[PDB]
Amino acid sequence: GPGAYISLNYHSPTIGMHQNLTVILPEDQSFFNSDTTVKPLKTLMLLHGLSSDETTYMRYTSIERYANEHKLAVIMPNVDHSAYANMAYGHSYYDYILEVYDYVHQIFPLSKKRDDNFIAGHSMGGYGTIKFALTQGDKFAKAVPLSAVFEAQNLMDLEWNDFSKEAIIGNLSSVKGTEHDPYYLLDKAVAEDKQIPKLLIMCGKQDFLYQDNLDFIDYLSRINVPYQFEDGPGDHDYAYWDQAIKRAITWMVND
């Protein structure tokens, strides 16, 4: 039912600047009793898409209502137009997500057990989610890409307002086969027998990335990596992501 909505602005050693972060911290009885041990909460790292920021899930969905119902802490960082990369000409935004993870688990009552930690996000943030799932599989038991970009070239080549592809990839001529390519990261994770979080992939059938989502899950099936895929009516918008994140939160906290 009740929780805390928290806005934090701290000077990040990784990206060299003050940066805003938002946190949903559902209430627990132990948080109000100085005689009892704090019960650490299950925790979701939740990644915004391109043009969104740390405020937009709160504004355009009812995520705090869903999170409070399931006692799930939610961490919402801001990564600008970075695509969750350590940018060639810009900020170290991949490392920044690792810093945020460590920081909030140190200063808040969040469980540090892998089974209690999840990651999710939409569009550019679903791309970010799969990138972290395949390279930081020891940190998250479950990962939920929503309406994700899996073929990196479609996001690097998109002509969105003020977006600079070169800020991210620099001198790279293509992203295929680089750290920016989720298919390469997947091949590397399997080849090196890394832990892959349990995967729930969701995408609206009217989304322009729907075919891209179908291509990725087919490849997952061909390399014997399990996943759950949920589709249905929905487009590339927060009307879909509001309903999708509600369904995702129920899925992540039940197992």
Tokens 């399990």 sit at which residue? Answer: 226
Q: Which is nearer to a second copy, 156 or 217 (CB)?
A: 156
Q: Which does 206 bind (CB under 5 to 8 A by kind): Na ion, a second copy, none?
A: none
State whether the Cα torsion 128-130-135-136 is positive or negative. positive
Q: Which residues pair with 25 in a beta bridge?
A: 4
Residue 50 beta carbon to Na ion: minimum distance, rounded to whole angstroms: 3
**Closest to 124 (Cα-Cα) out of 163, 173, 90, 176:** 163
| Binding partner of 208, given a second copy, Na ion, none, CB within 5-8 angstroms per partner class | none
Which option in a second copy, Na ion, none does residue 124 bind, with CB closer than 5 to 8 A by kind?
Answer: Na ion
β-strands 72-77, 42-47: how paired?
A: parallel
CA–CA distance, 239 with 60 (Å, rounded to integer): 8
Rounded to the nearest whole angstrom, what is the least distance from the CB of residue 247 to a second copy in the complex? 15
Please, which residue, 223 or 239, has the CB nearer to a second copy? 239
Identity at 200, one-letter amino acid code: L
CB of 63 to a second copy, least distance (A): 9
Q: Which residue has the tokens 């540090």?
A: 112
8 A C-beta contact, residue 87 and residue 167? yes
Q: Which residues bind Na ion (CB under 5 A)?
A: 49-50, 123-124
Residues lying near a second copy in the complex (CB under 8 A): 1-11, 13-20, 25, 27, 30-34, 38, 50-53, 55-56, 58-62, 64-65, 80-81, 87-92, 99, 101-103, 105-109, 112, 160-164, 166-167, 170, 238-239, 242
Residue 99 φ/ψ, nearest 5 degrees: -65, -45
We find the least distance from the C-beta atom of residue 5 to a second copy, in angstroms, to be 5
Binding partner of residue 49 among Na ion, a second copy, none, CB cut-off 5 to 8 Å per kind: Na ion
CA neighbours closer than 13 Å in the CB half-sphere of residue 68: 12
**What is the C-alpha separation between 177 and 15, in angstroms, rounded?**
26
Which of 49/234 has CB closer to Na ion?
Answer: 49
Alpha-carbon distances of 81 from 52, 71, 179, rounded to whole Å: 9, 31, 17
Q: Is 142 within 8 Å of 197 (Cβ atoms)?
A: yes
- Give the shortest CB-81-to-a second copy separation in angstroms: 7
The catalytic residues are 123, 207, 236
List the single partner that 123 binds among a second copy, Na ion, none, CB under 5 to 8 Å by kind.
Answer: Na ion
